[PDB]
Design an enzyme around this catalytic site. Structure first.
Site, PDB file in Angstrom:
ATOM      1  N   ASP A   1       6.307  -1.780  -9.693  1.00 41.63           N
ATOM      2  CA  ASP A   1       6.676  -2.617  -8.555  1.00 41.63           C
ATOM      3  C   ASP A   1       5.463  -3.356  -7.994  1.00 41.63           C
ATOM      4  OD1 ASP A   1       8.416  -3.478  -6.333  1.00 41.63           O
ATOM      5  OD2 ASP A   1       7.316  -2.106  -5.094  1.00 41.63           O
TER       6      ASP A   1
ATOM      7  N   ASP B   1       5.252  -5.340  -4.458  1.00 42.81           N
ATOM      8  CA  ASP B   1       5.071  -5.252  -3.001  1.00 42.81           C
ATOM      9  C   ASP B   1       5.195  -3.818  -2.498  1.00 42.81           C
ATOM     10  OD1 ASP B   1       5.196  -8.036  -3.424  1.00 42.81           O
ATOM     11  OD2 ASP B   1       6.601  -8.438  -1.892  1.00 42.81           O
TER      12      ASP B   1
END
Ligand SMILES: [Mg+2]
Ligand SMILES: [Mg+2]
Ligand SMILES: [Mg+2]
Ligand SMILES: [Zn+2]
Ligand SMILES: [Zn+2]
EC number: 3.1.3.15
Lengths: 160, 156
Positions: free
Chosen positions: A7, A9
């Site tokens: 991922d 953010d």
């Protein structure tokens, strides 16, 4: 082949609490140790894939140009420092769009589903990242800056 | 006596553009600078940044224009474990004929340190002259021919 699906953010860089959009350079901030730790993981034989939901990216709610600056700079830091993502997989859709590609759906990673499932991981900061792992039939690591951070992950995934 | 590396900024830690990193889209890290500075810190070197920023804080190069990219560059280094003891800046124009412009030694007088094992690392002849003026070693950084991996290997 061992893969890490990571991922963006709240995981590689911090997540802005107001609007969850890194749409200005003053909102770009790397998480501690991400660079040396990804280099360590690569040296242990992991390949890296980035996967991210960027709600509304390319529309007036999150203009492509606003995303590109901070994102391209982030990528320049990774590449110049030797961190190579095989792909950067982006879902630009809103939740209301009910698209096929929004994590934890697996459409973006379907080619990988090909890999060593026993030794591949999703790394992300949200329950959706952990659900992505379950949907892919691989392990999930829930990134937390204090209790499961980049140095800890670097250690855990190279343990023998 | 502490080992020091006095490291130039523009063209050395980050890419040199009008020679002013005054926009975020002009910021770019040099290859391998983070892992190599980490390696060098582990070998016991302390780091000091030293930079000539022509006309900084004037209409030519407003402080605010410098601050954004510089502070982001610092965020990145710091978050990755690279620490600079000091960031030494000369903001003057050459025509100012000031006391602090490299290769003059004013900014680093306090250090004037294990001289046999301390270095100026920079990409210009003036960085090498600074080394001479300080009585320490000089390394002429070149992205192609004398780069961060080479320096990291040499000094460790
Ligand atoms: Mg996240
Ligand atoms: Mg969201
Ligand atoms: Mg320079
Ligand atoms: Zn989608
Ligand atoms: Zn000066």
């Amino acid at each position: 082949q061992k893969y890490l699906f990571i991922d963006r953010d709240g995981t590689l860089i911090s997540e802005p609490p107001s609007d969850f959009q890194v749409d200005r350079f003053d909102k770009l901030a790397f998480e501690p140790g991400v660079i040396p730790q990804l280099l360590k993981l690569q040296k242990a034989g992991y390949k890296l894939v980035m996967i991210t939901n960027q709600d509304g990216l390319g529309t007036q709610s999150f203009p492509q140009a606003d995303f590109d600056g901070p994102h391209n700079l982030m990528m320049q830091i990774f590449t110049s420092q030797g961190v190579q993502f095989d792909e950067v997989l982006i879902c630009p859709h809103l939740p209301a769009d009910e698209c096929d590609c929004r994590k934890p759906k697996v459409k973006l990673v379907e080619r990988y589903l090909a890999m060593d499932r026993a030794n591949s991981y999703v790394i992300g900061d949200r329950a959706t990242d952990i659900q992505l792992a379950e949907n892919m039939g691989i392990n999930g690591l829930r990134y937390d800056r204090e209790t499961l951070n980049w140095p800890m992950i670097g250690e855990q995934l190279t343990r023998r």
